[PDB]
Amino acid sequence: TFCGPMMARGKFLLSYSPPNGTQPQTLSEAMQCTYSIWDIGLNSSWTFVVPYISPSDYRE
């Protein structure tokens, strides 16, 4: 959810990254992973859900 001024606009990018050697740092590296575009002005809550991925039936 956003809480700010009236006449301000912007853009945001949401992404998820599975495990690897280390957490991604650059937006360039992140962009390769799954991502979505959330505009500031279209709506105020761009819901996000992380898909369930794992090599088993459950997780610890």
């Binding site: 990254s17 690897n20 050697g21 280390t22 992973c33 991925i53 090599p55 088993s56």
Partner: protein, 217 residues
């Protein structure tokens, strides 16, 4: 279709000696001068994989040659690592040229393990669950290589695993090995020390996930 070169047979090789190609792990090191070029890198950008395999062998003897070679697909093996817990190097491969039988492998004695530390007494290691039974190798999918009729190798193993899928950088459930049944002998003049070549084909793969190129820990 990926192809690779193994070390060349010599009469100096003893019996029960062997060498193995752990797929798909060998790809990372391009074992035997093999470069898939597409799958090798595609694995890096993914994490979970599920595919089969299909292999082949070749070795050209001649009318005046004799010998016997054993080839089989043994799953869940862990013979591709040094006793400490590190995989061998290219220099080590070029040096050994072959894996010689030893009581350690017969007993699973020297497989990798974690050191206990300063808190404990030093235990006497005696046995392990990854022993090697030289004679009963024939139980698993296999074929023979006789100098009089050895044409090539062929096998197609279905997928296996503790789970439907596993991580690429760690999974190892299938492995190819070759064993020298009868020491090579021949009259001089014909093909001397024939080379051994291997081919590998995956089947019905399903790559999973997406991320940047994997980075070393």
């Amino acid at each position: 279709w990926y192809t690779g070169r193994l070390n060349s047979w010599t009469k100096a090789v003893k019996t029960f000696s062997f060498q193995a190609v752990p797929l798909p792990g060998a790809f990372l090191s391009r074992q035997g001068g093999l470069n898939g070029g597409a799958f090798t890198a595609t694995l890096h950008r993914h994490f979970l994989m599920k595919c089969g395999w299909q292999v082949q062998v070749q070795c050209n003897l001649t009318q005046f040659h004799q010998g016997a070679l054993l080839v089989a697909m043994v799953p869940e093996t862990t013979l591709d690592v040094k006793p400490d817990g590190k995989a061998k190097s290219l220099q080590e491969l070029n040096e050994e040229q072959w894996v010689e039988m030893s009581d350690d492998y017969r007993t699973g004695k020297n497989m990798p393990f974690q050191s206990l530390g300063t808190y404990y007494r030093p235990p006497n290691w005696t046995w392990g669950p990854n022993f090697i039974n030289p004679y009963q190798v024939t139980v698993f999918p296999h074929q023979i290589l006789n100098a009089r009729t050895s044409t090539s190798v062929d096998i197609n193993v279905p997928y296996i695993g503790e789970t439907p899928t596993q991580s690429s950088e760690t999974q190892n459930s299938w492995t190819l090995l070759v064993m020298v049944l009868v020491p090579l002998d021949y009259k001089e003049g014909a093909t001397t020390d024939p080379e051994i070549t291997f081919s590998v084909r995956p089947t019905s793969p399903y790559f999973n996930g997406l991320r940047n190129r994997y980075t070393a820990g």
